[PDB]
């Protein structure tokens, strides 16, 4: 008789790896030296269901990045590379977008960045509630702009931003790939108008579409008997 762990915040405010970001430090294809992530809550199926218990949600965000590096094999594993610096730039809704590792949009002012050297504690940056409306929508029964044009159930209004990742240093002499892991912990959660859990599996991350599943697991009889 406690009911302190059935709270909304003791149910949703837990960290979870949501995406893995792979990028290198020396290539020839000029887009494998960086990677990005458009921030949403629809990639981990667990957290997607736990947020689809409710229609409107409203939370802060605390992201912790776990950054690890492993060198690719070559002729020249015998090297002395100094410690690597990574950049994690945040693009708010309405910000410019880089198109290479040497693009000017890595240098712009109103895109907050974090510079981390190898060996330290993992980085961390908080992201506030940055919607125009009062709460995010998990569900949206309508069109975004000019109905019967545009995708059904979009809700332009609830975008949170996106991240970009590159190695700050120059091109090294051996290829070293770095994979980061993103721990997305929502904070100060308030939820409204609850709704039943999903029964069917998921098919895409941008719509509610499904194949019809059953209702439960079927029995053999209707009346029970002894062992």
């Amino acid at each position: 008789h406690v009911r302190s762990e059935s709270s909304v915040e003791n149910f949703l405010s837990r960290s979870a790896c949501v995406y893995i970001v792979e990028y290198k430090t020396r290539d020839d294809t000029p887009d494998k030296m960086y990677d990005s992530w458009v921030i949403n809550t629809r990639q981990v199926a667990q957290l997607r269901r736990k947020l689809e218990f409710f229609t409107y949600v409203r939370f802060d965000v605390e992201v912790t990045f776990v950054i690890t590096s492993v060198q690719d094999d070559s002729t020249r594993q015998n090297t002395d590379t100094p410690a690597l610096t990574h950049q994690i730039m945040y693009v708010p809704p309405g910000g410019p977008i880089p198109q290479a590792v040497d693009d000017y949009n890595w240098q712009t002012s109103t895109n907050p960045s974090v510079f981390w050297t190898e060996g330290n504690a993992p980085p961390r940056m908080s992201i506030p509630f940055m919607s125009v409306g009062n709460a995010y929508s998990n569900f949206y029964d309508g069109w975004s702009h000019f109905s019967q044009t545009g995708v059904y159930g979009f809700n332009t209004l609830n975008n949170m931003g996106k991240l970009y990742f590159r190695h700050v240093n120059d091109k090294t002499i051996s290829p070293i790939t770095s994979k980061v892991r993103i721990y997305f912990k929502p904070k100060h959660v308030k939820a409204w108008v609850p709704r039943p859990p999903r029964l069917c599996e998921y098919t895409h991350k941008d719509n509610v579409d499904f194949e019809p599943k059953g209702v439960t697991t079927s029995r053999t009889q209707l009346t029970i008997s002894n062992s």
């Binding site: 008789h1 406690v2 009911r3 762990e5 059935s6 709270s7 909304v8 003791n10 149910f11 837990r14 960290s15 199926a45 667990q46 269901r49 218990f53 409710f54 409107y56 409203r58 605390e62 912790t64 776990v66 907050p112 330290n120 504690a121 961390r124 940056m125 908080s126 992201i127 506030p128 509630f129 940055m130 919607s131 409306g133 009062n134 709460a135 721990y183 308030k190 939820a191 409204w192 108008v193 609850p194 039943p196 859990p197 029964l199 599996e201 998921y202 019809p212 059953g214 209702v215 439960t216 697991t217 079927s218 029995r219 053999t220 009889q221 209707l222 009346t223 029970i224 002894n226 062992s227």
Partner: protein, 224 residues
């Protein structure tokens, strides 16, 4: 400066941190909270809602709406059994995907009470009696109307009460839990030009004394 000693546990990312953090976006104006109706501050508000139970989950009836309808009609015997299911909210396949079973699959420990509700969806002219027996845990399933009668039972008259509510006492999975059987007492007496086949539907919700202790992952979401 000030002398400071580093204790062990430094420079690690424990996943259940509670420390402060710097903000990526200071100097930002957060839009204020508007009064939206229907606020949830506790998940055990959600499981206090009655919901239909698929008791008739005999095979090939699950993929339909017949999975909820419990058939009852006129019987030439009198001590037969209408339905029955094991009383395990979350382990049993009957109230597995029920909303209460869905709140209770996110926890490894749970305890409390449970309400059942039985509604008769026949005509206004029919009448009859049922025997809703409750076999406590440890006790077996009765095979007779008479063996179920000497236990804990309730006689529910159709002709004067269209819904009987049966608040089952203490049930737990880590604080065979019981059985709920339904026996005929009399046949369903019907006048002329009134159809014989009828339906019972179940409902279930928790009481206000329901607790949970340890969160986990749900056994129903499988990763692609």
């Amino acid at each position: 400066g000030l002398p400071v000693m580093n204790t062990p546990g430094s420079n690690q990312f424990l996943t259940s941190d509670d420390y402060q953090s710097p903000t990526a976006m200071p100097q930002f104006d957060v839009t204020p909270e508007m009064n939206i109706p229907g606020e949830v501050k506790n998940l055990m508000e959600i499981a206090e809602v009655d919901s239909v139970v698929p008791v008739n989950n005999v095979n090939e009836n699950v993929n339909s709406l017949e999975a909820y309808r419990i058939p009852v009609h006129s019987v030439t015997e009198t001590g037969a059994q209408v339905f029955g299911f094991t009383l395990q909210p979350g382990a049993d396949t009957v109230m597995e995907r029920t909303l209460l079973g869905e709140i209770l699959n996110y926890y490894a420990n749970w305890s409390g009470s449970i309400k059942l509700t039985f509604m008769y969806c026949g005509s206004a002219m029919a009448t009859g009696k049922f025997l809703l027996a409750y076999s406590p845990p440890g006790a077996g399933v009765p095979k007779n109307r008479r063996e179920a009668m000497l236990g804990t039972h309730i006689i529910w008259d159709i002709g004067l009460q269209s819904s009987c509510v049966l608040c089952v006492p203490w049930i737990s999975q880590t604080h065979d839990a019981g059985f709920i059987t339904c026996w005929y007492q009399t046949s369903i007496v019907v006048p002329a030009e009134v159809q014989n086949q009828s339906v019972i539907l179940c409902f279930v919700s928790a009481c206000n004394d329901f607790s949970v202790r340890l969160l986990r992952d749900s056994p129903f979401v499988r990763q692609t």
